[PDB]
Amino acid sequence: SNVVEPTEANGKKSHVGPHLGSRMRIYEYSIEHNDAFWAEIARRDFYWKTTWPDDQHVKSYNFDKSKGPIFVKWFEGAVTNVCYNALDRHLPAHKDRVCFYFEGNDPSVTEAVTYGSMYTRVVELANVLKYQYGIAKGDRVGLYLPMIPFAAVAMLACARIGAVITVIFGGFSAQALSSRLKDAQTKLLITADASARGTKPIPLKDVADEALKECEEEGMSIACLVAENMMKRDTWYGDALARLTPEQHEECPVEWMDAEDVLFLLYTSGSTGKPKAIVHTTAGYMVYASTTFMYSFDYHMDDVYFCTADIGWITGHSYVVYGPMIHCATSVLFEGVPNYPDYSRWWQLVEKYKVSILYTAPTAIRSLMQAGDDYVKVGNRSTLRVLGSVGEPINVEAWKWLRDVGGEGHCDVSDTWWQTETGGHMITPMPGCTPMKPGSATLPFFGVQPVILDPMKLHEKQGPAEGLLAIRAPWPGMARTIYGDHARFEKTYFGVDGYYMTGDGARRDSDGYYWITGRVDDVLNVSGHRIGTSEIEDAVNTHPAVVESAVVGFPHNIKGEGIYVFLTFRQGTEVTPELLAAVKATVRKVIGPLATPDVMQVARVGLPKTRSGKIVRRILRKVSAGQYTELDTSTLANPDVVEDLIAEHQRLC
């Protein structure tokens, strides 16, 4: 009864078919004939300077430590370029087709960027990187940009010449930006003078200057290219253009890449330690991101697509730039926020550009729900037919609101589960063919074999089951390693021979539908952003008066999960609102606003530790959630902390 059937119109329009059988027939084929399946997709849908030698052997891999090093290769011996598949090959047939319907935060700032215009922008920038900054195949380029056309231009210019990009979310502090540039050893930083988020100025160049001063004090010598959106080492993009020759505006050769040449680095939070650079290569990621974009959203050439994610996250890589452009999509590119000038903004964009596919996140949805349906009903949503959710679980009422108010009830919802490490969608509905259970990711994508591993015995559980979500077989979009640390990669994701461990928990029901329960490690999902507890603790501890801290998640009604901080101060410290405010500001300096603690509790007699000195985080998880029952607390070094924490927490309410 908790099932919503797809719309008949989406069934008639589906690339797959009108019935679930149409999807299952394809899926079983993608599993029984994995090589042939991906060989047909890659050959039908992409351009190759050179094709893999044998369609029988389009992949090789090892998911078992005990047999040797973990590895995965797709389309070995193939040669291609991501920029060529995203731009050049669409020309001249789709020269005048709109790539990005761009709007700034200021609604009077708009720009309809065609694929032809993207080409000019990319070759110009690519020639600047080549002949003015000496960017070569393999060189790392950092991006610190807002959601403007230049951000996609920069990712494709680097891809055109073989450069490895690393995108730093424009909301990260200077220290956060500095750390990522150093670890990637970037030759160049591309940024913009500033951006806007409502009425708040986002001066990006000034932050970047603080990051660069820090890198230069550490020995580095990083160049900076600055686009004018609203100066040492620092060159304005206009000055660089003025140095280009007329032919350098027209033409730039494509650097043809091998299947496993690196495409980008993306720093991702983990259960322990600082964020690590996840490494994605060329051929496999290209095929998987574009193929998932096509089927998970049933994109057709007459659709208009709008993803609200930032390029600084994997969602923006795969489903704002790389994926959509490779399938010659017409997309909306929005620099601003959903509540400026008011909360109708996204719906004004939907009718203005006749959007038919909208890809957003539960946190944004729940924010829109707090503002009133009237902010939605003033815009025309008759063109919407597919709605997408990503980043974290979506509750039933939010799912129903999205489809019924947002989509006027004539939409299919694709709640897609996946990760930075998976490259693209892994469990997702497909419009027209997949029955929907509100809150469920439903069925695995073509060529994906998920499993539920028993938490204690680490065996696969048949039929309905709850446990650890794992992937028992490789897929083209899988991350290949961690930058300069394959051992950490093997330990983190392949501790169970034969499986990729996702770090999520999930339940599978009697129809084979998957329900993702959230992280099972020390990783938080705060406002759809992935953040680790260890790095928040390290930031909290940098405050001169903080001795020790412990960070746990706890339930929140908009962000899903909030950040709860237990901390002890230096002796003789007067705890005041200002002090606690200065500690919040310390996290925002070290990391950024996305990691702002929500609650800060003083462990008045200390943090709960075992006799051996290990913090008992389960006790902190239970206290922050108000569960005072499931706590033996006598193995503690100081058992009296429990009543201190329960009391101080109730005093805070």
Ligand SMILES: CCOP(=O)(O)OC[C@H]1O[C@@H](n2cnc3c(N)ncnc32)[C@H](O)[C@@H]1O
């Ligand atoms: C794409 C973002 O990738 P990341 O930023 O690397 O976060 C990845 C992490 O977000 C969570 N997650 C993502 N999608 C969903 C979903 N549909 N339902 C429930 N949880 C989800 C999950 O915990 C995962 O492991």
Ligand SMILES: C[As](C)(=O)[O-]
């Ligand atoms: C190796 As085959 C032809 O069964 O995909």
Ligand SMILES: C[As](C)(=O)[O-]
């Ligand atoms: C993706 As089509 C060729 O059916 O518009």
Ligand SMILES: C[As](C)(=O)[O-]
């Ligand atoms: C929630 As976002 C627009 O920073 O991906």
Ligand SMILES: [Cl-]
């Ligand atoms: Cl059906």
Ligand SMILES: [Cl-]
């Ligand atoms: Cl059928």
Ligand SMILES: [Cl-]
């Ligand atoms: Cl196989």
Ligand SMILES: [Cl-]
């Ligand atoms: Cl080889």
Ligand SMILES: [Cl-]
């Ligand atoms: Cl069930």
Ligand SMILES: [Cl-]
């Ligand atoms: Cl803020």
Ligand SMILES: [Cl-]
């Ligand atoms: Cl102690």
